[PDB]
């Protein structure tokens, strides 16, 4: 019990903590807001 | 055009020229290009 | 005296801030 | 002609749309004319 549970509290708080570090590891929710944004501004564009 | 200081105007002129201190002009050439542009927080010019 | 232009000339051509 | 809070069209030159004035953070340069924000969208206006 005490030694998954420390593995756990060790690898969980270093996930965290690299993803916090990691600054492109939200890659494709940032996308679908890319698609969306892009989509959206073209339809603006299609008016000009 | 140019022009100097203590300078005589006649119909004909010789290839000396008038005494001055030296200087320096550039000439080049526009064509059309494009460029992007980036505009800081503020809202000012800083990379093209 | 040939010189290469580095980054001059740049202009703002629709003067919108 | 100059109203806050209330929207009302603007024309000026043409240029006539739909706002509401506010107060604003925008520190034209003297020979501009007006702003945009992100899709070009009219931002701000200086009166002539």
Redesign the interface.
């Known amino acids: 019990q005490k030694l998954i549970a420390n593995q756990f509290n060790s690898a969980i708080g270093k996930i965290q903590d690299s993803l916090s570090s990691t600054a492109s590891a939200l890659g494709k929710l940032q996308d679908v807001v890319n698609h969306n944004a892009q989509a959206l501004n073209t339809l603006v564009k299609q008016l000009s | 055009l140019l022009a100097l200081h203590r300078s005589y105007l006649t119909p004909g002129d010789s290839s000396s020229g008038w005494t001055a201190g030296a200087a320096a002009y550039?000439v080049?050439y526009?064509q059309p290009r494009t460029?992007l542009?980036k505009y800081n927080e503020?809202?000012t010019?800083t990379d093209? | 005296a040939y010189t290469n232009s580095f980054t001059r000339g740049v202009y703002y051509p629709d003067k919108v801030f | 002609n100059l109203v806050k809070n209330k929207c009302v069209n603007f024309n000026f030159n043409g240029l006539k749309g739909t706002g509401v004035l506010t107060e604003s953070n925008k520190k034209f340069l003297p020979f501009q004319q007006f702003g945009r924000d992100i899709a070009d969208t009219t931002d701000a206006v200086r009166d002539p």
Do not use: E, T, W
């Open positions: 550039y080049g526009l460029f542009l503020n809202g010019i093209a």
